[PDB]
Short mmCIF file of C-alpha atoms in Angstrom, two decimals:
data_model
loop_
_atom_site.label_atom_id
_atom_site.label_comp_id
_atom_site.label_asym_id
_atom_site.label_seq_id
_atom_site.Cartn_x
_atom_site.Cartn_y
_atom_site.Cartn_z
CA UNK A 2 -5.33 -0.10 -1.57
CA UNK A 3 -7.14 0.51 1.72
CA UNK A 4 -5.56 -2.46 3.32
CA UNK A 5 -3.65 -0.53 5.98
CA UNK A 6 -6.74 1.70 6.63
CA UNK A 7 -9.13 -1.29 7.20
CA UNK A 8 -6.63 -3.32 9.07
CA UNK A 9 -7.06 -4.01 12.76
CA UNK A 10 -6.30 -0.64 14.48
CA UNK A 11 -3.84 -1.94 17.11
CA UNK A 12 -1.47 -3.56 14.56
CA UNK A 13 1.56 -1.44 13.54
CA UNK A 14 1.58 0.33 10.33
CA UNK A 15 5.30 1.33 10.46
CA UNK A 16 8.52 -0.69 10.55
CA UNK A 17 9.54 -0.44 14.17
CA UNK A 18 12.68 1.52 15.07
CA UNK A 19 13.89 -1.10 17.61
CA UNK A 20 14.32 -3.75 14.92
CA UNK A 21 15.13 -3.18 11.27
CA UNK A 22 14.10 -6.92 10.52
CA UNK A 23 10.66 -6.47 11.90
CA UNK A 24 8.63 -9.49 10.52
CA UNK A 25 5.28 -7.80 11.19
CA UNK A 26 6.10 -4.89 8.84
CA UNK A 27 7.50 -7.47 6.29
CA UNK A 28 4.27 -9.49 6.17
CA UNK A 29 2.14 -6.21 6.12
CA UNK A 30 4.08 -4.66 3.34
CA UNK A 31 4.05 -7.86 1.24
CA UNK A 32 0.26 -8.19 1.54
CA UNK A 33 -0.04 -4.41 0.76
CA UNK A 34 2.14 -4.87 -2.46
CA UNK A 35 -0.21 -7.53 -3.74
CA UNK A 36 -3.29 -5.54 -2.86
CA UNK A 37 -1.84 -2.49 -4.70
CA UNK A 38 -0.88 -4.54 -7.60
CA UNK A 39 -4.35 -6.03 -8.00
CA UNK A 40 -5.87 -2.64 -7.77
CA UNK A 41 -3.47 -1.36 -10.54
CA UNK A 42 -4.50 -4.36 -12.68
CA UNK A 43 -8.14 -3.70 -12.06
CA UNK A 44 -7.77 -0.02 -13.06
CA UNK A 45 -5.82 -0.90 -16.26
CA UNK A 46 -8.64 -3.59 -17.05
CA UNK A 47 -11.05 -0.93 -18.29
CA UNK A 48 -8.88 -0.55 -21.46
CA UNK A 49 -9.92 -4.03 -22.37
CA UNK A 50 -13.62 -3.42 -22.29
CA UNK A 51 -13.43 -0.75 -25.08
CA UNK A 52 -12.86 -1.21 -28.70
CA UNK A 53 -10.86 1.94 -28.81
CA UNK A 54 -8.31 0.83 -26.16
CA UNK A 55 -8.44 -2.99 -26.43
CA UNK A 56 -5.34 -5.11 -27.02
CA UNK A 57 -4.35 -8.50 -28.42
CA UNK A 58 -6.69 -11.13 -26.89
CA UNK A 59 -9.69 -8.93 -26.25
CA UNK A 60 -9.13 -7.15 -29.50
CA UNK A 61 -9.35 -10.57 -31.13
CA UNK A 62 -12.49 -11.20 -29.31
CA UNK A 63 -14.00 -7.95 -30.70
CA UNK A 64 -12.79 -8.89 -34.22
CA UNK A 65 -14.46 -12.30 -33.83
CA UNK A 66 -17.66 -10.62 -32.88
CA UNK A 67 -17.41 -8.22 -35.89
CA UNK A 68 -16.22 -11.17 -38.23
CA UNK A 69 -12.82 -9.83 -38.80
CA UNK A 70 -9.92 -12.10 -38.12
CA UNK A 71 -6.23 -11.01 -37.37
CA UNK A 72 -3.71 -11.59 -40.14
CA UNK A 73 -0.22 -12.85 -39.75
CA UNK A 74 1.97 -10.20 -37.79
CA UNK A 75 -1.07 -7.83 -37.76
CA UNK A 76 -0.56 -5.42 -34.76
CA UNK A 77 -3.48 -3.91 -32.74
CA UNK A 78 -3.79 -0.49 -34.14
CA UNK A 79 -3.90 -1.59 -37.78
CA UNK A 80 -6.32 -4.39 -36.86
CA UNK A 81 -8.77 -2.05 -35.16
CA UNK A 82 -8.52 0.37 -37.92
CA UNK A 83 -9.40 -2.55 -40.34
CA UNK A 84 -12.44 -3.57 -38.29
CA UNK A 85 -13.67 0.02 -38.10
CA UNK A 86 -13.17 0.39 -41.84
CA UNK A 87 -14.84 -2.93 -42.50
CA UNK A 88 -17.89 -1.84 -40.57
CA UNK A 89 -18.07 1.50 -42.64
CA UNK A 90 -17.69 0.14 -46.15
CA UNK A 91 -19.66 1.89 -48.88
CA UNK A 92 -21.04 -0.51 -51.35
CA UNK A 93 -23.12 -0.34 -54.57
CA UNK A 94 -21.31 2.43 -56.51
CA UNK A 95 -18.50 3.09 -58.81
CA UNK A 96 -16.36 4.72 -56.08
CA UNK A 97 -16.81 1.76 -53.74
CA UNK A 98 -15.68 -0.65 -56.47
CA UNK A 99 -12.67 1.54 -57.25
CA UNK A 100 -11.63 1.69 -53.59
CA UNK A 101 -12.09 -2.14 -53.32
CA UNK A 102 -9.72 -2.74 -56.27
CA UNK B 393 33.20 -11.91 39.83
CA UNK B 394 30.73 -12.89 37.03
CA UNK B 395 30.95 -11.45 33.42
CA UNK B 396 28.50 -12.37 30.70
CA UNK B 397 26.62 -11.37 27.54
CA UNK B 398 23.64 -9.00 27.65
CA UNK B 399 21.26 -9.15 24.57
CA UNK B 400 20.58 -5.62 23.87
CA UNK B 401 17.14 -4.65 22.70
CA UNK B 402 18.84 -3.20 19.61
CA UNK B 403 19.92 -6.81 18.69
CA UNK B 404 23.66 -6.50 19.49
CA UNK B 405 24.99 -9.22 21.69
CA UNK B 406 27.01 -7.17 24.23
CA UNK B 407 29.65 -9.63 25.31
CA UNK B 408 30.94 -7.33 28.08
CA UNK B 409 33.36 -7.48 31.10
CA UNK B 410 32.31 -7.74 34.75
CA UNK B 411 32.04 -3.99 35.43
CA UNK B 412 29.07 -3.76 33.19
CA UNK B 413 27.54 -6.49 35.28
CA UNK B 414 28.32 -4.34 38.25
CA UNK B 415 26.55 -1.47 36.49
CA UNK B 416 23.53 -3.71 36.13
CA UNK B 417 23.64 -4.63 39.85
CA UNK B 418 23.82 -0.89 40.73
CA UNK B 419 20.90 -0.11 38.47
CA UNK B 420 18.95 -2.88 40.16
CA UNK B 421 19.71 -1.69 43.64
CA UNK B 422 18.97 1.89 42.84
CA UNK B 423 15.41 1.02 42.12
CA UNK B 424 14.93 -0.99 45.32
CA UNK B 425 13.57 0.56 48.49
CA UNK B 426 15.77 1.50 51.48
CA UNK B 427 16.60 -1.47 53.44
CA UNK B 428 16.06 -4.15 50.76
CA UNK B 429 18.77 -6.31 49.31
CA UNK B 430 19.74 -7.56 45.84
CA UNK B 431 20.01 -11.17 47.22
CA UNK B 432 18.22 -13.78 45.18
CA UNK B 433 16.92 -11.18 42.75
CA UNK B 434 17.01 -11.79 38.98
CA UNK B 435 19.64 -10.09 36.87
CA UNK B 436 18.01 -10.32 33.36
CA UNK B 437 21.32 -11.54 31.81
CA UNK B 438 21.24 -13.84 28.79
CA UNK B 439 24.43 -15.84 29.46
CA UNK B 440 27.54 -15.93 31.73
CA UNK B 441 31.15 -16.86 30.92
#
């Protein structure tokens, strides 16, 4: 969101008093809105690259890498908890069998 | 004699009577040097009735 900063210095950055319908300010604010929205989306994208904070599609990618597939109507929190539990399954003892049952 | 519309920089179309045109001639003549004349000079008016 450095679009106004790196813009050509002579162009106006502010809607001109002489005309409320200044098309230059309209175009500039439009482009600035898209720049800031893309920056927002890029900042929020970090949550998809972590198992802790991943959501639907990327969480399904993680579960496909771990081997665990989403059930019918299975939300993200319970699904990630199920993946984490599936990785940490004790096996080979009475307590493990009792928990599995 | 003439009256016409002056398009203000603010965007209002000032359709005004003839004494505002006289105000424009007087403002033109005040800027002109002593001895000169407003004859054949432009008036910067958008339209006339």
